[PDB]
Amino acid sequence: VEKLPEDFCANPDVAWTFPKVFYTSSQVFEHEKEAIFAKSWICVAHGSELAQPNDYITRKVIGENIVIIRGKDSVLRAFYNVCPHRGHELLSGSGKAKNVITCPYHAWTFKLDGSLALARNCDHVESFDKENSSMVPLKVEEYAGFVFINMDENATCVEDQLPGFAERLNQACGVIKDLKLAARFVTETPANWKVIVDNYMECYHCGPAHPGFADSVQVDKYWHTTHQNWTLQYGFPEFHGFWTWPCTMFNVPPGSNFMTVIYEFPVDAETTLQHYDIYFTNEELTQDQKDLIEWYRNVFRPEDLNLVESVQRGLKSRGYRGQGRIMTDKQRSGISEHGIAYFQHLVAQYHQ
Amino acid sequence: VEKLPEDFCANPDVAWTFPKVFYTSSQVFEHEKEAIFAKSWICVAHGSELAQPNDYITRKVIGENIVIIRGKDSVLRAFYNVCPHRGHELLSGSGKAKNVITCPYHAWTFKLDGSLALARNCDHVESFDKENSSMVPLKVEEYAGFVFINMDENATCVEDQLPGFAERLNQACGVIKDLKLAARFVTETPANWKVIVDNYMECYHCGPAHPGFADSVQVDKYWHTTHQNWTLQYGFPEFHGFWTWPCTMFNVPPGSNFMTVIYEFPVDAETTLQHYDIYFTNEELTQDQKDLIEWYRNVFRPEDLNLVESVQRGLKSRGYRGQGRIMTDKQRSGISEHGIAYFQHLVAQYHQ
Amino acid sequence: VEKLPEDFCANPDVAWTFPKVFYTSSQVFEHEKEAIFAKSWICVAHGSELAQPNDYITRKVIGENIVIIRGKDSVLRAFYNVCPHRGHELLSGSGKAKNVITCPYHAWTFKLDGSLALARNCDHVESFDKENSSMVPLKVEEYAGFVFINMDENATCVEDQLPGFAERLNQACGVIKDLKLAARFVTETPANWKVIVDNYMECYHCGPAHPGFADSVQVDKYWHTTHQNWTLQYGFPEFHGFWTWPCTMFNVPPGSNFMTVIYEFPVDAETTLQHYDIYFTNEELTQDQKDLIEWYRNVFRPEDLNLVESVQRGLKSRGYRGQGRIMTDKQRSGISEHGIAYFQHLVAQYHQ
Ligand SMILES: C[N+](C)(C)C[C@H](O)CC(=O)O
Ligand SMILES: C[N+](C)(C)C[C@H](O)CC(=O)O
Ligand SMILES: C[N+](C)(C)C[C@H](O)CC(=O)O
Ligand code: FES
Ligand code: FES
Ligand code: FES
Ligand SMILES: [Fe+3]
Ligand SMILES: [Fe+3]
Ligand SMILES: [Fe+3]
């Protein structure tokens, strides 16, 4: 029942953020849950986690426990992680599956393509239906070295969602096929998923909110350019910060020899599960990599987590007029907030 | 407003579990809360806890704090555990009440039958009603050596709910009257009460889910026969497992000299408080009895608690088609799931 | 949405408490939140906390984070604690502000009167509206030596809400202007705000529920007189206990040189934030004052917190008939509950 104009934030030079209800309403969240997150490609992992036959991972997004698994035939598949008998979860965590999936409850077994292998005693069950007792699939695709799922059977391909993105990312970081997961920070953040994207889409805040990092880095004339359902923040010692629709962020810091990736998995209007993954090419970490990981964990990320959490609380106040001015300038400077207008302009298209 | 056919699961040979909404909907739970648990006899304890005058226990079921108390006149009574003046709780925990109940807030005193003994200054309050300032009762009955409460004043008697059950239980365990509480495991379980019953009503899962247990024991016949709102699982050193409507289960393991009892006290659609009681006839326990209690606590029960918790999560998934096939076999073998159909057929009569 | 008669508890000699729904319903709370707490003067502190230029405190009441701040010009002001840019909270805790407020997010600065000082880069933002970018004020007034806020722009003055109260309080304690905060107990209490007022408005409970305190003191005359939206419990070495609409209580114990203040900041139907402040005229504390603080913290207050928490649980029971008799005696004795009737008669006017 809450709608946005089709031209909402179409002019970034004179633009404001959503009326606050869009950050807080459970009704708005339920619509975005089905119109956006059940019908878009959702990045869930780096390819290194699913490279070999029988490799699998599990993810939870908008209330759906999903298993992605590389088959014995090396075909990548994704399934709802729920047994078609009486609903027990099939796999937990991540690792290497055996040659069949065995349900922990009554030990029905499934091939890695989801088809029912053996249902105990089914020969003695009247009219047992073998073809509707398979695991339920969804779409999965490998794109740009990462892995995306899609709950909409009618989805096309990741490239139609993020045209040109793979090429640009492989141009910022040429070592993607050999990156390996070094650390993952798991946090349930009490902020709307769009508030966390807003926080990523500008550098207006890094001076005030990231003193130790911005003070040492003399970064001026850093540009934020929009493309097709993704954007690129590029600064100088190159920096790359990609945002991709709806809410996965890829960062290639100065060395261009490593990456950090932010995965946002919305839970409800005021809760978002975040994975903060750090990837290096070497499995054995040096102490310089170990220290860098702890700087991310204990110094950098807490500052951004605190910001979006305070904003979520303030957004409910009757003392917040309703919308915030997006501080875009004529020059599209490094401190311009125009990236927020691009993101919210796209979001508004789902609120017509 | 979610209704089931009257013939739901009337034919166990071709049957499926409830549509998933019945295990997850708060609307369904509120209906079951009032149509079943406020109008059925609810087992709360073994008789040994209330055998002497002034004995009392407290229970919480469907949001109601209940005090069950044996009066000075040796009459067993049950009351809502709330003062008639301004609503302070009257008793906590379990034990021996003094000869009057004294409310901790304004020290009104009540007799063990619920009557107001003395309300201070009531002589000076205009039109004070001594007889509607008594504790509010509900029905209680001793049946089969156990204690049942009922929130419906128009209820009849436990035998009308469970015809023949006491006669049959006393044949399975001839020493019930001499049982004493040896251990109680209290768990607030994140599963619908009906998922927990499903898990009790079949042995399809014992091989897969209780490996250490199914591996040691060579069971030479196993039958699940239905009766009158209760069922009996009987195996061969006999084993007896009774389920009684709505959700109390009584087990008589091989020795037949001790019992374990499962009490389910539903909290909401996705939460059930469970009591797992172990009763032996001797007050001082042997080292083998202590060992058996720890096997139940740390090996056996966690396996069943984990199953129902995983099922409750999987039942919410859009990848669960909706209903699960009840694996009934022609022979009604030891691993047949037909007990579930009987249970769910009874539940369905409450969703007309 | 069930309404009360205009004469509800108009006759204290024959009166009952609200039907239990008024203490538990979220719908009732939402009405009282907007009709009472967003339209009444809410006491937040003693003036001593805001006496000097740049002093500030923060409070939270009915979901609103408020900052009260004494400006460089020595004018006392209050603001919603939310940045007009993108909603980050502005200040935390209490203390001495710098000469401008700096937002932690993007470092907009505000003078202590709420007006925008500096918005970084605003010179390059098209059509930037500086005078609709100030912090949002609400009304604040110093009254009786304490500080009140009001969320209703059309509010008048505290004296219109509490006629004669300041005049009578300064007769109870003549040194209010020299008091200083000696101790504060902060508790999120799981009780409706009206249950907590009930608990304050009678001494019917002091004998049974405060045993160590009742036997210890000698009371030669104790009266509870009602006025205009406030009441006075007065005893003899005088004692004064003031309740003021809606739920701030001021205590002047026998020595009549110190004060105890209860602030209730409701959160929802079943949750109330309480501040219990103890004020002495000397800042450097004696051992007897220090001992007295601990008796309040660990002996006296826990008894009252436990009473209201148990009452809130009991009010939900179907075994509570619905309303409780207010134990008013014809002689308005020391243990008469007639004060509850006065309070509930005032509350009832909002449920017509
Ligand atoms: C894009 N930018 C620099 C604004 C956000 C940073 O990339 C934060 C991060 O990479 O975790
Ligand atoms: C009936 N059966 C054996 C399947 C369940 C077990 O009795 C559970 C139990 O004894 O606690
Ligand atoms: C009003 N009365 C005496 C009932 C309550 C006490 O004043 C509570 C208090 O002083 O904190
Ligand atoms: S739930 Fe998977 S086999 Fe029964
Ligand atoms: S509440 Fe039990 S006596 Fe007042
Ligand atoms: S939110 Fe306060 S300056 Fe950006
Ligand atoms: Fe940041
Ligand atoms: Fe089991
Ligand atoms: Fe008290």
Author numbering:
A (entry chain B), B (entry chain A), C (entry chain C): 4 to 239, 256 to 371
Q: Which text from the study accompanies this structure?
A:
The carnitine monooxygenase (CntA) and associated reductase (CntB) responsible for carnitine oxidation to TMA was originally identified in Acinetobacter spp. but was subsequently found to be present in a range of gut microbiota species. CntA belongs to a large group of non-heme-iron–containing Rieske oxygenase family.
The high-resolution CntA structures cocrystalized with the ligands (carnitine, 2.0 Å; gBB, 1.6 Å) allowed us to define the substrate-binding pockets. The substrate-binding site is formed by a series of β sheets and two α helices coordinating the substrate through hydrophobic/steric interactions involving residues Phe258, Tyr315, and Phe319 and polar interactions with residues Tyr225, Asn270, and Tyr295. A water molecule and a thiocyanate [SCN]- anion occupy the two coordination sites, which are 2.2 and 2.3 Å away from the mononuclear Fe center in CntA, respectively. Both the water molecule and [SCN]- are positioned 3.7 Å below the Cα adjacent to the carnitine ammonium group, which is expected to be the site of hydroxylation catalyzed by this enzyme. SCN- bound at the O2 site likely resulted in the stabilization of CntA cocrystalized with the substrates. Together, structural, mutagenesis, and structure–activity relationship data therefore suggest that the substrates for CntA are primarily coordinated through a π–cation interaction between Y203 and the trimethylammonium group, which positions the substrate in place above the mononuclear Fe site for oxidative cleavage to occur.
